[PDB]
Amino acid sequence: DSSRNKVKETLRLFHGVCRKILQEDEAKPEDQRRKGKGLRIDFEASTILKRNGKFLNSGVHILGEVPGVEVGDEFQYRMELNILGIHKPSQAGIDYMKYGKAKVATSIVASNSDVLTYTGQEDQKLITGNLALATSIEKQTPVRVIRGKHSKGGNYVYDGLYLVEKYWQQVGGMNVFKFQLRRIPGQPELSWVEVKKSKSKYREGLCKLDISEGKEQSPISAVNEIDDEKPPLFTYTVKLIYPDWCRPVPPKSCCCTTRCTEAVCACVEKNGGEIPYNFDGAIVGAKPTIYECGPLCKCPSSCYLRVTQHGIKLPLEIFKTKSRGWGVRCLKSIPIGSFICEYVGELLEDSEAERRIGNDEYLFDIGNRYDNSLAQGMSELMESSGFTIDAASKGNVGRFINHSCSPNLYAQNVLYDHEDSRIPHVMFFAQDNIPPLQELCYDYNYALDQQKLCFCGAAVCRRRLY
Numbered sequence: 401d402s403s404r405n406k407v408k409e410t411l412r413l414f415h416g417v418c419r420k421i422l423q424e425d426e427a428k429p430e431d432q433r434r435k436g437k438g439l440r441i442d443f444e445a446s447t448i449l450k451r452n453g454k455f456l457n458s459g460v461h462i463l464g465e466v467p468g469v470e471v472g473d474e475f476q477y478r479m480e481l482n483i484l485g486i487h488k489p490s491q492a493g494i495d496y497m498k499y500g501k502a503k504v505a506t507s508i509v510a511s512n513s514d515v516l517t518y519t520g521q522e523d524q525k526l527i528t529g530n531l532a533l534a535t536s537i538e539k540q541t542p543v544r545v546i547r548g549k550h551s552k553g554g555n556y557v558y559d560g561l562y563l564v565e566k567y568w569q570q571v572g573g574m575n576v577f578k579f580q581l582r583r584i585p586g587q588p589e590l591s592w593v594e595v596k597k598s599k600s601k602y603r604e605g606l607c608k609l610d611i612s613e614g615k616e617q618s619p620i621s622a623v624n625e626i627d628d629e630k631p632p633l634f635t636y637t638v639k640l641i642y643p644d645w646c647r648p649v650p651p652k653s654c655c656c657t658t659r660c661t662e663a664v665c666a667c668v669e670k671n672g673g674e675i676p677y678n679f680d681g682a683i684v685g686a687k688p689t690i691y692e693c694g695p696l697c698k699c700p701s702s703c704y705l706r707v708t709q710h711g712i713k714l715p716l717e718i719f720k721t722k723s724r725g726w727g728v729r730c731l732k733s734i735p736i737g738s739f740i741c742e743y744v745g746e747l748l749e750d751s752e753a754e755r756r757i758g759n760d761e762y763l764f765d766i767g768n769r770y771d772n773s774l775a776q777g778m779s780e781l782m783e784s785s786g787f788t789i790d791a792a793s794k795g796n797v798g799r800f801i802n803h804s805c806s807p808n809l810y811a812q813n814v815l816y817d818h819e820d821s822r823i824p825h826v827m828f829f830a831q832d833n834i835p836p837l838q839e840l841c842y843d844y845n846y847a848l849d850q851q852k853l854c855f856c857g858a859a860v861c862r863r864r865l866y
């Protein structure tokens with residue numbers, strides 16, 4: 401609830417600190433850098449959050465559901481599990497707590513879909529963690545299972561609550577304990593099961609293979625498992641449509657022959673003397689404006705300042721919701737800070753967009769969307785436009801992204817093929833590690849009374865869309 405938002409914002413803060421530390425290391429000459437030394441940005445970020453009182457459920461073990469943590473949630477670092485109190489050991493696979501005179505397991509990190517076999521702990525002994533997991537069988541107390549998928553992206557997934565049914569002992573060439581767990585009925589489906597079904601021959605609800613019809617480099621399918629509706633009529637466009645008096649003037653370019661770096665390069669200077677992306681392509685954090693290198697920059701395509709201009713990289717699809725029409729999701733998980741897509745449509749003066757008929761549901765009002773909340777919290781740890789994008793008649797997949805009061809995306813202004821700040825590119829970025837098939841949403845930011853109810857379903861919902 402408030403708990404859900406607290407959890408998400410705590411993880412967001414953590415990754416913000418990680419990527420700021422990394423940004424500061426990447427700003428150094430490639431021998432003053434510590435990443436080789438075995439810099440540990442997750443460890444350092446964890447220490448910073450700890451000293452500033454940001455850990456949740458600290459000093460206590462929890463049996464069963466953890467408030468604000470949901471089945472399917474993903475984590476990049478094991479340390480995130482400790483920050484949230486999901487799983488306390490930094491390395492050990494089994495976490496446990498006192499229970500009556502005994503100890504029972506609270507959580508395991510694990511490397512017929514409701515059934516799981518888990519390997520324990522040079523013979524293994526029935527002590528500590530192994531003994532606790534064994535005791536879970538007798539008490540029939542719940543165990544949280546965190547599944548390791550195997551580096552940016554979700555590496556761990558919360559798969560929910562399980563019961564331990566039995567254990568046995570076998571040669572691993574020394575002796576090991578093995579445990580069989582079974583998922584408690586009534587929980588949301590495992591995300592790996594949902595993904596498996598989405599990859600099927602006969603996948604239910606498939607309406608259209610490609611709503612772009614060949615224009616996108618990768619097809620964007622449409623799925624409807626709710627009703628018989630097919631996707632709405634519109635002309636798919638991967639290119640912005642400019643008025644003629646707004647066609648791009650050649651921007652200032654940089655003379656760098658190698659990839660651009662900083663804390664010489666004009667484009668680094670545009671960004672305030674720093675690189676707004678990490679070297680792995682993820683955005684460090686939202687800013688009012690990001691300047692990418694342009695067509696005449698001497699730098700290679702691999703330039704750290706060339707990200708959103710390369711277009712969609714993720715496998716997107718549109719799908720039917722029960723109460724908000726069509727929305728957008730991704731067939732795989734999305735690492736925090738990843739570029740999603742642009743909001744593409746016709747660029748119009750606000751007055752022109754307003755005058756036109758039938759387009760009100762597909763307008764992106766440019767400007768005043770930078771949220772500096774995170775920048776502020778992080779500092780504690782250590783402009784307007786007269787233009788609108790009309791995607792009603794002509795637009796890309798961006799027109800289908802719904803609103804949420806607790807969104808997993810945000811809009812980011814980007815300039816690269818021109819310097820006209822009145823009409824920046826509107827680029828969406830992830831602000832969570834997003835589970836596969838989770839609906840993608842951002843804050844529409846409509847002012848109330850300039851009525852329509854908000855159906856985003858968040859616990860902190862502001863109740864009205866406008």
Ligand SMILES: C[S@@+](CC[C@H](N)C(=O)[O-])C[C@H]1O[C@@H](n2cnc3c(N)ncnc32)[C@H](O)[C@@H]1O
Nearest residue numbers: 724725726761762799800801802803854855856
């Ligand atoms: C840009 S369209 C998004 C795609 C749209 N759902 C469709 O089927 O084409 C914006 C419209 O989606 C609906 N919508 C988006 N988010 C909503 C929300 N949180 N609550 C209620 N309706 C929403 C509203 O009808 C809104 O006018």
Ligand SMILES: [Zn+2]
Nearest residue numbers: 654656660665
């Ligand atoms: Zn440069």
Ligand SMILES: [Zn+2]
Nearest residue numbers: 654667693697
């Ligand atoms: Zn440049």
Ligand SMILES: [Zn+2]
Nearest residue numbers: 660693699703
């Ligand atoms: Zn460059």
Ligand SMILES: [Zn+2]
Nearest residue numbers: 805854856861
């Ligand atoms: Zn809402």
